[PDB]
Design a protein around this ligand. Structure first.
Ligand SMILES: O=C1Cc2cc(Nc3cc(Cl)ncc3Cl)ccc2N1
Ligand SMILES: O=C1Cc2cc(Nc3cc(Cl)ncc3Cl)ccc2N1
Ligand SMILES: [Cl-]
Ligand SMILES: [Cl-]
Lengths: 122, 4, 122, 4
């Protein structure tokens, strides 16, 4: 018999993104080629099957630095990190291939699905 | 607020 | 020119609640009278003006244990902690006064607003 | 997915 506040989840995500932009309580650096991205482990786990597997591992859960596969494009990662914290995906003709490949690697099934749909249309 |  | 995934914020919050239920990556214990509640600092900050103030403080941001004011009722806190992680508020005749008082202390303005509306109706 |  609960009541529900419709905007609560969106407002929580917006505040988590504000913490990220101000580098507050970020507890991991994701290294993609030369590029470094600071984030919250919990948000990464909540969005990605790959980060979920990494941070539930008894040894890896304690690492402050995670290095991604050298094939991963920093721009593709950046677009996906922004999606994790906002629900908004900057999908463009020039980045769609790098975004799909990064989403497949990160195990973000809904992003993979929209990328496949957009590629099929063109 | 709504009835979920 | 982004696209948006409608269910993303709700799905993120659902996964954060799954991490909480399994005690994964929880980094703080909130003590309310005898009762202890494990949580994620970032989620507490995203939902509460009080926890936002506490964990942005250069000294308090590093505490693993936070003790609330002895006037705070553990059940009222538990109902509010569940709301933070789910968007669902278990508001009942027998708990509404304790929920409103706890929400005022935690600075959760939307919960305070619905409590005042429900009290006014009765 | 929608146009926000
Ligand atoms: O496409 C995806 C997105 C995703 C997220 C998570 N993260 C969780 C899943 C569960 Cl059940 N509890 C807690 C968490 Cl943080 C796992 C796999 C995938 N695949
Ligand atoms: O009723 C409320 C809920 C709430 C949440 C937060 N938390 C933040 C606010 C900002 Cl601007 N950036 C980041 C965070 Cl985590 C502060 C005050 C209040 N009052
Ligand atoms: Cl996804
Ligand atoms: Cl609120």
């Amino acid at each position: 018999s609960c009541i529900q506040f419709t905007r609560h989840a969106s407002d929580v995500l917006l505040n988590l993104n504000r913490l990220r932009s101000r580098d507050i309580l970020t507890d991991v650096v994701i290294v993609v080629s030369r590029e470094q991205f600071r984030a919250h482990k919990t948000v990464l786990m909540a969005c990605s099957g790959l980060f979920y597997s990494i941070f539930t591992d008894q040894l890896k859960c304690n690492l402050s630095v995670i290095n991604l596969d050298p094939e991963i494009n920093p721009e593709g990662f950046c677009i996906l990190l922004d999606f994790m914290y906002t629900s908004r995906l900057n999908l463009r003709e020039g980045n769609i291939m790098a975004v799909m490949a990064t989403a497949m690697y990160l195990q973000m099934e809904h992003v993979v699905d929209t990328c496949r749909k957009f590629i099929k249309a063109s | 607020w709504v009835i979920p």
